[PDB]
């Protein structure tokens, strides 16, 4: 079975930035990939639609997915509030890596990040589970509205998301 492709359509201050297309590596991390896929489609009754990129740091990563507290302290997975680190097989190889945000070991929920640089120091600490395959330019636009603290200069909103099937 082919790896799922999913999308995020992103606004800045109500103005469309475009579409990010992500391949989820369900072959290597099936459980982590399925959580993200299901949060994109909303099929458990909750997910990413309408939530924000709440922490964006230039030359590091763009972080999103806290649809419960919208500030980096929340989120939940389709398995429960948190689920374990599935494996650390895939590595933070460069820009475009899609990886799980966490608050330490075995705290995956819904928050995720897209790298804008090789973040190798996160290897073995954050579960990588996909990669940008179209729309890296959009990711760079998101990055342009970040700051050193991560606070965004514009409201960055995932206005739609889903699975490309
Ligand atoms: C409950 C839950 C479940 C799943 C995910 C999450 C998100 C998770 N919430 C948090 O921890 C906190 C703490 C808290 C409070 C209440 C409940 C739970 C936790 C709240 C949000 C703000 N909060 C801390 C940070 O912001 C932390 C930054 C950090 O960990 N600082 C170290 C160096 C940096 C790097 O390497 N910086 C390089 C800078 O180079 C700039 C170049 N120009 N590492 C990082 O950011 C590591 C990293 C990596 C990817 C994604 C996220 C994160 C951080 N995890 C968070 O945000 C929370």
Residue numbers in the entry: 1 to 165
The authors write:
A key structural feature shared among all cyclophilin isoforms is a shallow and highly conserved PPIase active site. Adjacent to the active site is the S2 pocket, a distinct exo-site that forms part of a long substrate-binding groove for peptides. In particular, three gatekeeper residues (positions 123, 124, and 145 in CypD) and one far S2 pocket residue (position 118 in CypD) are highly diverse among cyclophilins.
We also observed migration of the R124 side-chain contingent on the size of the S2-binding moiety. As the ligand grew in size from B3 → B2 → B1, the R124 side-chain gradually moved from tucked in the pocket to fully solvent-exposed.
